[PDB]
């Protein structure tokens, strides 16, 4: 037993990390096949950031205004197409190291691994979750712009996230790789509301299931409950309501623990009402909600 | 702002992960240049594990009793030397992918990244700390045997850890790459005492320094203290005593925060005495002690 936050191996993604410079500004891009993706705001001076017009800005740019470095390798840019908030750059060479990939738009509650770069170089990797309000709570400092998040699918890298901007709050926003923001955000330096966050209920249950499996079980109740019961609790404590589908996804855990979901939903109810009273679950002393049921299953079998 | 547990990029290490089979038992090895390292207990049946004689066991083995798979590549073994608890295997090919490396024995309190494998394949990466009692509190399931931990040094992979065994408790023990256990442990399936753990005080301070830097500062005291004062507190709450050297290492943080160490040692003293009263520091609601001062500095500058 023992259970920590764990990220996919990053090697496969390290191979695609390039630096992209365009005047002053210089950030990280993702170079796949013969295309290189990055946040479109590379084309700004920090003066433009205040209220850009990305077309009128972009219009005064030619391939040659774009430096793309891969370690010590240079790529001639030969084409440049803005796609929403992402910039695409056609280049002479196709990345040798391009792995099998897709682009995907993930959903609130879903986790991914993130590789944080600084000027086309990986410094570190961590796992995180898209919040219900389409933000994340990670660790990104200047130059980390254009860092990416992804899941790995045996062989296949599903890319879900490109990092753009921090919110006054210390939470992050960013796009899918088609360049559509996750959330109601825009690439402009103006007051922008995060919006009220909720707790990812399905995950929390997942986490408890993980607990039971590792030995930590003191919180196992004497009761049960129905759905409506518990949802109507959840509401109060800003938990996301639990559908049938959340139950079905948990079933695999029902199975391994031989614990019906609703008996766990009824352990949660109490913890929610009674607090945790100083004791620890899996070491943590609050309710971790950034492991999916899928996550727990990867790590409580052996993938 | 925002600050999470973050692991070095693993690519460089992924290239060295091989599977090693020897009869029944099959676990992960590390293949560097023309040598392959793994826990010596591969040579056991689970019957031997009860009380092995590793020489008399090893003596009945020939190179050919050893299957070494790298994805779908086979290595002829041509030499086999037990070195304490690790096994070394000479092989025809030198790993093409061998990066710059050293082997190092780290010290209580020091962190590293860990890449967890299953049958010569990386499933995941996480960061962790060697506890004062030479254990770790990670996430290792069967087949993860021979997984490794390491720091990366711009270009250079310092290997510090090879995983051997779990303790009834759900904490792990394992060797340096010379094959000497960290701690008073042996590769045998018998009752073995973890020993009393302490909290890594220097790190905790480091963590607070990280807090202040990210905005979280409610815990900033009205007082100060001397060393003896605080150490004599630490004792009670099972904290490691703080040397001058711990102060010197923290100084860089003193500098960036313009907060004298002892003013922080005096914020800690109170938190220790007063508890945390439900509020959160950097989200966590207890005292994280698994980031080094070095760690905080990597992430609170931009390496
Ligand atoms: C580059 N990585 C950076 C993101 C953050 C700076 C500090 N740490 C980071 O990760 N990108 C930007 O500079 C980013 C985007 C918009 C401004 N911006 C911000 O992060 C700002 N935030 C906003 O303007 C927001 F809309 F989110 F409120 C700020 C004020 C620096 C936090 C542009 C420059 C295009
Ligand atoms: C292989 N990875 C495994 C380690 C742990 C099994 C479950 N999760 C793990 O990470 N290696 C072993 O089987 C390991 C070493 C010794 C037994 N052993 C154990 O982990 C056992 N523990 C002990 O015997 C200990 F001394 F630590 F108390 C146990 C009972 C499975 C927890 C050998 C087989 C050589």
Q: How many Å apart are CA A41 and CA A300, to the nearest integer? A: 41
Q: How many Å apart are CA B84 and CA B135, to the nearest integer? A: 19
Q: Are B40 and B179 in contact (CB under 8 A)?
A: yes
Q: How many Å apart are CA A125 and CA A245, to the nearest integer? A: 31
Q: How many Å apart are CA B82 and CA B206, to the nearest integer? A: 40
Tokens at residue B225, please?
Answer: 């203290």
End-to-end alpha carbon distance in chain B: 16
Window 2-21 of B, Cβ < 8 Å to A: 2-12, 14-15
Return the active site residues of A: 41, 145
B246 assigned to active site: no
Q: Which of B175, B209, B225 is the last residue of a domain?
A: B175
Count of structural domains, chain A: 2
Q: CA neighbours within 13 Å on the CB side: how many for B226?
A: 3
Q: How many Å apart are CA A191 and CA A174, to the nearest integer? A: 16
CB atoms closer than 10 angstroms to residue A228? 9
Q: How many Å apart are CA A140 and CA B2, to the nearest integer? A: 7
Task: Note whether residue A192 is domain-resident.
Answer: no
Pocket test for ligand 2, best of B20, B148, B165, B170 (most atoms within 8 A of CB): B165
Q: How many helices (H) and strands (E) does chain A have?
A: 7, 13
Q: A218 and A148 in one domain?
A: no
End-to-end alpha carbon distance in chain A: 16
Window 122-151 of B, Cβ < 8 Å to A: 122-126, 128, 137-144
Residue B149, strand partner residues: B114, B161
Supply φ then ψ for residue A126, to 5 degrees: -145, 160
In angstroms, what is the span from residue B200 Cα to ligand 2's centroid?
26
Q: Which CATH number is A42's domain given?
A: 2.40.10.10
Write b or e for each residue in B41-54: b if 16 or more Cβ atoms lie within 10 A of its Cβ, otherwise e: bbbbeeebeeebeb
Q: B162 and B44 in one domain?
A: yes
Q: B167 and B205 in one domain?
A: no
Q: CA neighbours within 13 Å on the CB side: how many for B179?
A: 17
Task: Note whether residue B25 is domain-resident.
Answer: yes
Closest CA to B265 of B255, B276, B252, B254: B254
Window 66-105 of A, Cβ < 8 Å to B: none
Q: Are A242 and A195 in contact (CB under 8 A)?
A: no
In angstroms, what is the span from residue A215 Cα to ligand 2's centroid?
16
Contact A280 B303 (CB under 8 A): no
Q: How many Å apart are CA A86 and CA B165, to the nearest integer? A: 47
Q: Taking the alpha carbons of A271, A273, A275, A277 in that order, is the dihedral positive or negative?
A: negative
Closest CA to B275 of A295, A285, A187: A285
Q: A281 and A161 in one domain?
A: no
Task: Note whether residue A211 is domain-resident.
Answer: yes
Q: Which CATH number is A215's domain given?
A: 1.10.1840.10
CB atoms closer than 10 angstroms to residue A203? 25
Nearest atom of ligand 2 to the alpha carbon of B146: 2
Task: Note whether residue A184 is domain-resident.
Answer: no
Q: How many Å apart are CA B300 and CA B3, to the nearest integer? A: 9
Q: A140 and A26 in one domain?
A: yes
Q: B252 and B164 in one domain?
A: no
Q: B92 and B55 in one domain?
A: yes
Q: How many Å apart are CA A242 and CA A225, to the nearest integer? A: 13
In angstroms, what is the span from residue A164 Cα to ligand 1's centroid?
7
Q: How many Å apart are CA A281 and CA B24, to the nearest integer? A: 36
Supply φ then ψ for residue A265, to 5 degrees: -55, -25
Tokens at residue B71, please?
Answer: 């994805």
Q: Are B226 and B188 in contact (CB under 8 A)?
A: no
Residue A284 DSSP one-character state: B
Q: B147 and B96 in one domain?
A: yes
Q: How many Å apart are CA A173 and CA A185, to the nearest integer? A: 7
The single residue listed with the structure tokens 């109490």 is A270
∠ Cα A4 A219 A136 (to 5°): 40
- β-strand A156-167 against A101-103: which pairing, if any? parallel
Supply φ then ψ for residue A256, to 5 degrees: -70, -30
- β-strand A171-175 against A156-167: which pairing, if any? antiparallel
| E strand segments, chain A | 17-22, 25-32, 35-39, 67-70, 73-74, 77-83, 86-91, 101-103, 111-117, 122-129, 148-153, 156-167, 171-175
To one decimal place, what's the resolution in Å?
Answer: 2.7
> In angstroms, what CA-CA distances link A113 with A102, A176, A285?
15, 14, 24
DSSP B287-298: ------HHHHHH
Q: B223 and B145 in one domain?
A: no
**Which residue range forms the structural domain that includes residue A260?**
201-298
B26 touches ligand 2 (CB under 6 Å): no
Q: Which of A128, A159, A175 is the last residue of a domain?
A: A175
- β-strand A25-32 against A67-70: which pairing, if any? unpaired
Q: Taking the alpha carbons of A125, A126, A129, A131 in that order, is the dihedral positive or negative?
A: negative
Q: B268 and B126 in one domain?
A: no
Testing the interface with A: which of B11, B111, B147, B294 to mutate, by most A Cβ within 10 A? B11
∠ Cα A275 A279 A281 (to 5°): 90
Q: How far is CA A238 from the centre of its chain?
A: 21
Burial class (CB in 10 A: 0-12, 13-18, 19+), A181: middle
Closest CA to A174 of A159, A164, A160: A164
CB atoms closer than 10 angstroms to residue B225? 20
Task: Note whether residue B192 is domain-resident.
Answer: no
Q: How far is CA B210 from the centre of its chain?
A: 21
CB atoms closer than 10 angstroms to residue A188? 15
Q: Are B261 and B247 in contact (CB under 8 A)?
A: yes
DSSP B93-131: SPPTT--SEEE----TT-EEEEEEESSS-EEEEEEEE--
Task: Note whether residue A74 is domain-resident.
Answer: yes
Q: B47 and B147 in one domain?
A: yes
Q: A169 and A53 in one domain?
A: yes
Question: Most distant CA pair in chain B: distance in Å?
Answer: 69
Task: Note whether residue A191 is domain-resident.
Answer: no
Closest CA to B28 of B164, B151, B158, B160: B164
Cβ neighbours of residue B68 closer than 8 Å, sequence gap 6 or more: B18, B19, B20, B21, B29, B31, B36, B74, B75, B77, B89, B91
DSSP B121-188: -EEEEEEEE--TTS-B-----TT-TT-EEEEEETTEEEEEEEEEEEETTTEEEEE-TTS-BSSS--SS
Pocket test for ligand 2, best of B126, B189, B195 (most atoms within 8 A of CB): B189
Task: Note whether residue B227 is domain-resident.
Answer: yes
Burial class (CB in 10 A: 0-12, 13-18, 19+), B2: buried
């Amino acid at each position: 037993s023992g259970f920590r936050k764990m990220a996919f191996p990053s090697g496969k993604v390290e191979g695609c990390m390039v630096q992209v410079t365009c005047g002053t500004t210089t950030l990280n891009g993702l170079w796949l096949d013969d295309v290189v993706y990055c946040p479109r705001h590379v084309i700004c001076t920090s003066e433009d950031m205040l209220n850009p017009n990305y077309e009128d800005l972009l219009i005064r740019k030619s391939n040659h205004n774009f430096l793309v470095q891969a370690g010590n390798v240079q790529l001639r840019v030969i084409g440049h197409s803005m796609q929403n908030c992402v910039l695409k750059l056609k280049v002479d060479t196709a990345n040798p190291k391009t792995p099998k990939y897709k682009f995907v738009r993930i959903q609130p509650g879903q986790t991914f691994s993130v590789l944080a770069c600084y000027n086309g170089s990986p410094s570190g990797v961590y796992q995180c979750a898209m919040r219900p309000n389409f933000t994340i709570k990670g660790s990104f400092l200047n130059g980390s712009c254009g860092s990416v998040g992804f899941n790995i699918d045996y062989d296949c890298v599903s890319f879900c996230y490109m990092h753009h901007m921090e919110l006054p709050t210390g939470v992050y926003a960013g796009t899918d790789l088609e360049g559509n923001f996750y959330g109601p955000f825009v690439d402009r330096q103006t007051a922008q509301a995060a919006g009220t966050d909720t707790t990812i209920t399905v995950n929390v249950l997942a986490w408890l299931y993980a607990a039971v499996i590792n030995g930590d079980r003191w919180f196992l109740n004497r009761f049960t409950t129905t759905l409506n019961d518990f949802n109507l609790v959840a509401m109060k404590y800003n938990y996301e309501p639990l559908t049938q589908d959340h139950v079905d996804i948990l079933g695999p855990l029902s199975a391994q623990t031989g614990i019906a979901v609703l008996d766990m939903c009824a352990s949660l109810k109490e913890l929610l009402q009674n607090g945790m009273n100083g004791r620890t679950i899996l070491g943590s002393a609050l309710l971790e909600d950034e492991f999916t049921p899928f996550d727990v299953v990867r790590q409580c079998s052996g993938v």
